[PDB]
Design a protein around this nucleic acid. Structure first.
Lengths: 49, 64, 84
RNA sequence: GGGUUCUAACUCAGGUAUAACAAUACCGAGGACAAUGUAUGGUGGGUAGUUUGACUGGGGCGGUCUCCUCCUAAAGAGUAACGGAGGAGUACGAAGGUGCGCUCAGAACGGUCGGAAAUCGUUCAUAGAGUAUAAAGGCAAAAGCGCGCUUAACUGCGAGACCCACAAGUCGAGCAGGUACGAAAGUAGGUCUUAGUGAUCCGGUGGUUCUGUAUGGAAGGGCCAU
RNA sequence: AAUUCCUUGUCAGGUAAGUUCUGACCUGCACGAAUGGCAUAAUGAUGGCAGCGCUGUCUCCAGCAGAGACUCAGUGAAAUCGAAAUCGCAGUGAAGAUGCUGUGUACCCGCGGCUAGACGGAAAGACCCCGUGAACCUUUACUACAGCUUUACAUUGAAC
RNA sequence: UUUAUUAAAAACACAGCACUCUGCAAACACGAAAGUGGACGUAUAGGGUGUGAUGCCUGCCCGGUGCUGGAAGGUUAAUU
RNA sequence: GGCUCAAACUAGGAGCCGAAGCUGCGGAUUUGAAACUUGUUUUCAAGUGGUAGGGGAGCGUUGUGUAAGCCUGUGAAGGUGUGUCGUAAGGCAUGCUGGAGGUAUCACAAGAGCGAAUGCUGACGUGAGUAACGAUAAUGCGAGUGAAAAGCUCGCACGCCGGAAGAUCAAGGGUUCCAGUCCAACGUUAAUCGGGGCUGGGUGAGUCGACCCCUAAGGCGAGGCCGAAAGGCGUAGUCG
RNA sequence: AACCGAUGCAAACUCCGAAUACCGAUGAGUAAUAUCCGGGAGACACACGGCGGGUGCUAACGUCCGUCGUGGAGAGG
RNA sequence: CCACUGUCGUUGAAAAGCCAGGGGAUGACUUGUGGAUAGGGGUGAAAGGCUAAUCAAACUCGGUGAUAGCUGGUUCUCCC
RNA sequence: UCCAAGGCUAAAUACUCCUGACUGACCGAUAGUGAACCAGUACCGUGAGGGAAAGGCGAAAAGAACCCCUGUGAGGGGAGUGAAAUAGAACCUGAAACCGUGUGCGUACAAGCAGUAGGAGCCUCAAUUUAUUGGGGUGACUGCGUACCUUUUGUAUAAUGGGUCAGCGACUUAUAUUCUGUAGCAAGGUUAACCGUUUAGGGGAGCCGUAGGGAAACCGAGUCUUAAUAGGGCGUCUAG
RNA sequence: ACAAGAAGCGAACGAGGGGAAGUGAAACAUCUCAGUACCCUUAGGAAAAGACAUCAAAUGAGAUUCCCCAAGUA
């Protein structure tokens, strides 16, 4: 994986870009169709857990 | 346990999209005075990894 | 190497192909922006409905049918896009 | 800020005792040197680890390696040879834009120096010239040659195509903003076109609210430009 | 010339005839003075050339003796080996044929010889090339290190 | 003397010659150091290098690279 | 081979031969097509050379459950023939041999299939009854014993060594030394013989040697010095 | 030297200029088509016979291209 | 004690010998016994010689199933 | 948030020279330990070290008294034992290579991968009213026909490999991931370690799916770029 | 000059002192191999570690060790 026989591989002719965010890994997106698994009427972060 | 290793340098240049991967374009780091302003403008931004090349990207980045 | 008359004559280089020529021939349907002729100089001239690029490239300004004709007092080769 | 001296650290592979080697004591000789530890510059095939390309009518030697133009190339494209010929690794704030205006090379005739040819006048004269730069293809609406004003050698883009394994490369009407020239319709996103070029990584610089490891910053990073 | 390519240089000697030898010439491709120059008695299982003696080295081989070879009795290997009912020629053909074509010849099987072929046996060619192979060696290749050396600090102090 | 087992030689050694180093805890060598050799020696000695009895001798070049000596100037580490 | 009004050449004409081509007949198979509809059936159409390679369907072998089953001394596995069946891998049956195990069916798991790797181990071929039988110092004959004598014992003769091929040791070996007995293997042949097998015997020291006392080179080395550790060196000594 | 008139030649000459080939349109019939997406490859030493050439000597079972057929991987006559 | 020449031998009597000759043979001699130097090390009158029939880096074990874009081989059957 | 320069501290964790109990879709004598056997042996090496081969009579030795040939030998034939003695100690079974003996046919005038398609004759069995078929063996004569593997553009190739036989010998295993098939559930699916009186049951931590855009903040069927609500990029309108 | 210990051997596992190269990077030096092989010291049925001069940033938790995730993520 990552070898073309000698020409600089595609993952090295192109530049690295962007940075990883720590916030993105602790922010979860919740769908309206998943709410049937909640017990009760309150929808909070602790209740989604 | 023993897991497949991501190509950690190929993950810094390819990002998962819905139906494929995206990437930056080359020829934009240095010597930019001689390039027409169309090149500076259309070499700027995202493209999609080619259909030809995205089997390699799938083998290099198995987890994205 | 008796008669010793041989010897190096270094002329073994050439340039890459340029893929010039007619891209869309007469009577064909064409859409605006389609390149008709890639050329050096004006071997063909831009008639009605055909634009001309800085490369001397002839392209369709509007949809229709591409047509070739020799017109004018210079007997020039013209390419036109007839609205058909 | 340098030298002289001293002895007390330290040294003795010096003498006298200690059976012997060593150590110790004293005497003697040096002495803040020498020597050693850390750091540092030099030297260092003494030794180690390695590298030292490919194409190629075998290899070596020589030549070549990227780009452009012509032919080979078989009237679409493409097409090889250590096949035949040449160029490029630039230039220009005008040699770009626009508006306006103009037409060349030569030959002959006449005319001071002055001729074969300088400058002037006349008649023929679709380019036998020019086009910054090789060649090919173009060029009168001149793309050739002058003048005035200028900065479109813009910014965000771009329907649609050519070419293409990819990465790249090429052309592009139209739209928005801000202009330049023109009385205006308009033209202008560099130059008649095709060579004048080099990915990523890394590092620098001009900007930017994007991030900012408890929090506010900052460092660092990201994005845009170079 | 242990050096000289051209080259068997040229001239002299030696031989009937001498690319070698000896003497000389100097036109030293490309000698030369302690990686010593030129000689040198003696020494050398040293190199070259020339003689006497002597000879089966040879003309040109002959005879003879012993040990094998050959026969019998006893013991009993070897390498090799796809399988063989294993001929010549001229062709053909992965380009030099026992095996294919055409043709010629040839009754079956031993023994003693022989080595022209079986591209005969033996050793995955050592020559040549290739492999981003190896080793060892060299250096003003690169990068290190040992060793040697420089200075600062420490062991390390006092006075003028 | 030598390539035990295809090379015995013109190769190596050799007495002799020269240069150079070394003042003694010598230079130099083994070693990680202690400890050794050099040497229970001491510059007529010891080491390294070249040459190689003897006879006649051994010319010129210090530009390069070494080696030895010198420090006016330039540059120059750690450190501060 | 042979061929001359051809069996040559040119121009025509008519027959015929000639392939795994085409057709005829029988059978299999891939894909698609109308339906009792999963091969439930009858057909039809177009196909079915094949390396690298891709796809599909199966055979056999060892083991597990099925199986405290079923088969088997009225003969298991294996071996060796024969017949028969299937497109094949292969199945079934059975004669003989054998003498104690085997395994239907369906799943499941593999040390699951060999002709090649100058493959590995064992066995056995060819060469071939061929080369050779190990210094050219040499043997002949008469008796004896014996199953058998060129080779053993005895005898006469002959030849060889004799600064050894004779004697004494050290080293090394270890019973090979002597006798009786045997001859399978070993001895490059035979063997009654032997350094072979088997069974007994044999080596007697104050003076020969070792041990012992002493030390050389060189080791080890209370303490001692040095070194990450291991260890290196070294004095007195102690070995040698 | 030119200029006129006859007369030849040229890959890098063209006042000209096919056949084919290529790019389109329309239309029948025939055909186990074309295209796109994904799983698995193998191959990237080719050879000869034609045709058009370069190179060589219009030499080579030579070499390098284009194009077709066969072999490769194909028996049979 | 050596090893200069030749024949033989080359599946040898012998993994270096025999035979006929050859060299040194009081010396830088030959030899017995014991000891020392150990692998990038030793030793070398120097041939890269020798260091247990092994030498341009011994042998044994281990890392180790080193790696090998190379060569060889790769085992039942049928259908497309 | 916690107080270094004082010292301790069980369990859950790692392992097997071993002792016991038990187990195996582990091997079965070329396997399994190198070693089923007098094996770390023989043997090789100065040494460190390397390192084999080699199992089976029979239920019970009942292991063959005695006789005969031979050398009081080997070996055998009788007798006897035994169910079996081509189970007789080299002993269960006894394959192949390889070597003999017997019978039938062919073969000494004919040129080659040794076969194949025909085919006369002969020999031998079973039927049959008696040479007529059928089965088996042989193969005079005719046609065609240059092994196999590997590697190659291309091999009978005089290119590689194999003397033969027998036995062994090469795509595995663990985990991750992707696609396909199949099964269960299905906008949901599924637990892992663990506990467990252990293939159950529990354990929801976690993972995948259900939303994307953007470097990111952020927004979200949208989002990014932009001055732009324009244009364009990437998404949207289920099955996991 | 008197008593008590130690010595040496023997599987693996632990702790500690030293520490490669083949290999991979399709070369190779940073890097990898790997703190592995090996050498050396030494213990116990285990060893080590262990009670916060530790995390966390939530509504806070509360020594060490080991397993599944987090995650092939940062």
């Amino acid at each position: 994986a990552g070898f073309e026989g000698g020409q600089t591989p595609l993952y090295r002719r192109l530049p690295k870009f962007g940075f990883t965010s720590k916030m993105a890994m602790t922010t979860a997106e919740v769908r309206l169709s998943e709410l049937n698994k909640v017990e009760g009427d309150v929808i909070s972060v602790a209740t989604l857990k | 346990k023993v897991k497949m290793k991501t190509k950690s340098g190929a993950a810094k240049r390819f990002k998962r999209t819905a139906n494929g991967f995206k990437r930056k374009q080359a020829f934009k780091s240095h010597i930019l005075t001689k390039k027409s302003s169309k090149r500076i403008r259309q070499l700027r931004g995202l493209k999609m990894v080619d259909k030809s090349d995205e089997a390699a990207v799938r083998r290099m980045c198995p987890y994205i | 190497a008796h008669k010793k008359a041989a010897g190096s004559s270094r002329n073994g280089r050439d340039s890459n192909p340029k893929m010039l020529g007619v891209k869309i021939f007469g009577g064909q349907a064409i859409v605006a922006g389609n390149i008709i002729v890639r050329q050096r100089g004006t071997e063909f001239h831009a008639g009605a409905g055909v634009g001309m690029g800085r490369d001397h490239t002839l392209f369709a300004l509007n949809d229709g049918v591409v047509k070739f004709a020799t017109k004018g007092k210079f007997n020039r080769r013209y390419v036109m896009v007839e609205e058909a």
